[PDB]
Amino acid sequence: YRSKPTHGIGRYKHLVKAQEPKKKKGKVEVRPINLGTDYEYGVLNIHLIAYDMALAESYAQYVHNLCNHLAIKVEESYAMPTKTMEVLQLQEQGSKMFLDAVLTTHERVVQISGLSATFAEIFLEIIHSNLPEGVKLSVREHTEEDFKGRFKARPELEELLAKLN
């Protein structure tokens, strides 16, 4: 009751976040990209690319777990779509090619939030030092272009876009 001294003892909605439900019409990844604070870098993507699926994911888990211990907020731990390349070698004493092997590439990305400017030297020092074997670390900014690769292709728009131009 209002007048009782025990008013508001059951208050809980200020403890949890609002947790906006994913509405059917309003479902959208609204990301307020933060850029250039006094000592906090923007949203960064830790692109880990390796040829072996097991090795790429194993180091991806280490990066994600390391951030949690270091109080680094991790927005997502998604995975870039894989790319497959047909390795063709040239035949000796000839010119016609032959199918040598089928090698694929696997990319795992651990998106991270802002970090203190001092911690940038320390955090990256641990990462690049622990690159197991052939893992191509790539810490780039989280631009929408770097995030466009996760989606599909839309030739229906490209038919319109070409005619618009």
């Binding site: 209002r2 007048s3 009782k4 008013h7 403890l15």
Partner: peptide, 29 residues
């Protein structure tokens, strides 16, 4: 006519602001 509580409130120790910094329960046990 609001009255003053006779002692400390239960959940007033934790900070309402900066919710993400506070570690959650994550468990029911």
């Amino acid at each position: 006519r609001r009255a003053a509580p006779l002692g400390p409130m239960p959940n007033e120790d934790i900070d309402v602001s900066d919710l993400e910094r506070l570690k959650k329960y994550r468990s029911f046990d």
